[PDB]
Amino acid sequence: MMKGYILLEKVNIENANAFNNIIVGIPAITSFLGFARALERKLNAKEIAIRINGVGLEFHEYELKGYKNKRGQYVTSCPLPGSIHIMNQAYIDLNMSFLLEVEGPHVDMSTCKSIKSTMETLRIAGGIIRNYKKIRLIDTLADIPYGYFLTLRQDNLNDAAGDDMLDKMIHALQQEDTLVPIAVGFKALSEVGHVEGQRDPEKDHCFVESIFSLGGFECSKILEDINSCLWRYKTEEGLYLCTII
Amino acid sequence: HLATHVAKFTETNSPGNIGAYDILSSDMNCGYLDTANAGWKEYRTNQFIKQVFFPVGGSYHLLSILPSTVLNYEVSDRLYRSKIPKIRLRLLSSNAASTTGSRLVSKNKWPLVFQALPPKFLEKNLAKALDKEYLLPDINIDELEGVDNGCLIDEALLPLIIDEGKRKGEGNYRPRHLRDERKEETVQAFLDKYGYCNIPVGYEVHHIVPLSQGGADSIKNMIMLSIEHHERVTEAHASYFK
Amino acid sequence: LKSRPENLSFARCLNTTEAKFWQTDFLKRHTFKLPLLITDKAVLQKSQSCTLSTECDTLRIDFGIKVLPVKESMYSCSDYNYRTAIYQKIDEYIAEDGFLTLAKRYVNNIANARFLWRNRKGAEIIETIVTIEDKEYPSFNSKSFNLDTFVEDNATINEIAQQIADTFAGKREYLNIYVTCFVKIGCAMEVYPSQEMTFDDDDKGKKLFKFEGSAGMHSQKINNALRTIDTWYPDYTTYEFPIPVENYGAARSIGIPFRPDTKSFYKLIDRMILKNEDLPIEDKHYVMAILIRGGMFSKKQE
Amino acid sequence: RPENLSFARCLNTTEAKFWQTDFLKRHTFKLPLLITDKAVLNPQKSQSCTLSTECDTLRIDFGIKVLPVKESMYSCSDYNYRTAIYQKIDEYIAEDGFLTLAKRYVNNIANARFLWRNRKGAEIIETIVTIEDKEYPSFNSKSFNLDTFVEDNATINEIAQQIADTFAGKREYLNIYVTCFVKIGCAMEVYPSQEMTFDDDDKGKKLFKFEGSAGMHSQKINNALRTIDTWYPDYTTYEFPIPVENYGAARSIGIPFRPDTKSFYKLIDRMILKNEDLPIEDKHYVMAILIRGGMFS
Amino acid sequence: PSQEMTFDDDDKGKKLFKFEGSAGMHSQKINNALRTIDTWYPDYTTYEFPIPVENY
């Protein structure tokens, strides 16, 4: 039982779901959190017994699946619908990297082969893995290549002019260009019982809606803390969420 | 119709009247926002709606995700006059919205939507696709001339090697972090290139564009050299790659 | 058991990536390789078109395939009896055939290089090369293979079909295939890349697939020619050409469904798990063929 | 009318690239021709192309590629239509095999009609075909007229026999590459194609840049070769050929010429379904349209 | 004499010093010859030679 962190370096994904609710481009972070949880479950199916809790995102390159129409606005592309008309979807080519806060025994020069074997049956936000560049276990603060980290900056999200989120989001968005909208977890309702029609009937069912906040990009050289990134799960009385504290 | 949480928006072919509405208004300045925290000017079983799993610290909970179509209508009019970047989405026809049966979606079936682009020096292009592709020599196939088994043996061919180092990879230099890595497969490459048991003591390893303007660790992009030849080309390549 | 589960989902077992185009000659194929940018033209309109340079003769297309087992790739099943029943059926099919009669045709498709659709007509010579990440394979000429007469007695076809049938059975867990092709058209002729579904308020031209400038093809189209081996549909003896594999047989070329009768997917699953009758080998071939492609196989609740 | 039916064009042309030579060393000389720019008097920038002062001949390089009509049948939504098209094409090729139109196509290359304005004022025009290692005999395009078609040559008959036999019989593709030389003078004004601009506050004259230098459109070099429609009614009075199209008349005259009498929106209801016998000029028009292709629904 | 560095790589061979129609020596070499008198560095007994008086 020792604390460490693994790095998934330069994972490029085609057709990742970039149309979560309102944000076109960067997907919801719960996609990456559930990807880390699916990797944790895949390693738990094997008898390695290794836990993962904490994930930070480092974006390198992005390609919205489209072009520019006249002046700079984007028009996006889509496949042809078939056997069961198109309604609303978008896709992206991401080239980003993962920091996974890894907590569990027997990590040094181990579990990398298991992660490599179990990664091939995984999709990041519904997109193909293709070829990630490397898996690394270097335990330094300056172990990051030249990328940009998407963190939770609750400064203009919290303190800005405007009475409420709506009359405050766009007003906090004019003066800062790096700051971007981010879907951050999701909670709506109650009645956690066992109503039918579930994907797995032996679980807890709910009717849940996405929630939103702000985010920002900082380089690998200039930074504040590891604790200012590496997003964590959190749970309350029906208010499941992901945050950095 | 006009409810905030209506189905048949993220997908289709889901026969249901799933409307959750909103009788709760908690509009405090928290660290987040929801459909009730917004401006907001305007539920049993599930099939063909997105279902996810979330850990509660202990077990897992299966959660069905409903859209925020009132926020989808409000973002369009908020972004109509705003100056931050925005991405249009013309991925719809009128008959699909008529079949779906939502009056709010019918007025805004081609919405002006929020977006989150990473900064504009991160978007890929032709140079950002050609930097990951590295050149190859146009002659190295087998023992052609001046060569017994891989190594450049005879003389009067190092001008040919110097013009193969030229004529490819000129003016297209990349930064240091935009360079191909040196993998650990290379020891097995010297093992099974021609039949060597290990790295020869009497030979070295070299490429034709070493760490400058292309070059990768392929199965053919290495040419082993002698001491004098490598010593000469270390300055010969730096003569034009100053 | 009486009915299909309320939520059944299958992952696709043949995940292809999008391809990208490059222009090269036929005497300098593996040697050098130029980017094929999408240029623009005047039409009487703003029409995007692509063509080779005046100093090139062929074009080059590279794309990759990933193979996952059908047994393991069950993403969501809301039952245990149905899961064990189809598991037993899959083990029975492995024991009796070994998933080889499907894989031979799945590699017959790439043997004739059907993934270059309008690029095939008028071409001079083809050099489709298939490479796995550990083993290289000999090339073949796509003009010697008919588009209807399949080959079930080749060598490279048999080897690759067996090596992918082990993954289909469940012996391995993944497979990666890299394919390169060198269709020879002529000097400064026209190539035919893919075209997007980007609607526009003002524009009325055709925009082709950019993909960082260097043109290419969608993975949806490049997969469609690798699963067009259905010759077991009814009245096949009056048509003499294969069709792609779907549920209802609704090929977009014709508009009349090829197999909408009881020889289908729903009405064969209703006759396989529940009935457990000795349906012939072609029906089982089709059933595991559509189960390889996968999708959403939930029962029709209302 | 039936479901989605379409076609592909059976003859294909590249985009010709302009050059500039001198007629003394016309085999061994080749110089590029870049589109200049000079403003004209009103705020407006316009481009113009002209030769240099030390040369004398314009050069055009373009190649043709032919496929069979059976191999060019693209979108088939019904097999009754497809087998009717097959039967009509085989009863056409049972006796001549597209021999009427291929000869006129090869003649239309042979006059060098593809230069729309560069033929206005020329001393000598020659046409060379050198696709294989063998060299075809050189041409004399100044000894031809627009209205009449010649039928008794050697190289025209040989090449027309080659395309008319590859149209149905031997092989699927065939490529023939042609090079043309026009003597217009010294440092004169040459006319490449024009580009459809789409920006406001600019009355530009953006000419066509192919591979940087001057060039020619593909739809314009395929509009001169498609002008052979000397079978339409009211031809003896007007006495000029018209480009072949699904409607009646081109945009040159404005008024329609064949809106009802012979047009693919009208006669195909009484051709593909009734299969009644038609005169050979109507069949020539129908397979001229099926040579061009396009949507037919 | 001390060579004239890698000025122009037209001649790959080692050049020499040429000024006023003769050879000689760079006087930076003479300067670093006369500057080698420092025997006050740390761990003098381990190495035991003079070192040129440089910044470090």
Next chain:
RNA sequence: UUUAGAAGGAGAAGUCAUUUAAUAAGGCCACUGUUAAAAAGUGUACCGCCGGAUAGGCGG
């Protein structure tokens, strides 16, 4: 166990015509570039032989 699981964009085209931009014009005046340095790794590698396989070994 990730707004998870799935998907054929297609065929066809004529952008064309002419056009004078030009008259007039003062870049100015003054401010020390200096401090200090390692190009040279050994800069070229021959015979007498025994050996008759161009194996391999002694001496100058």
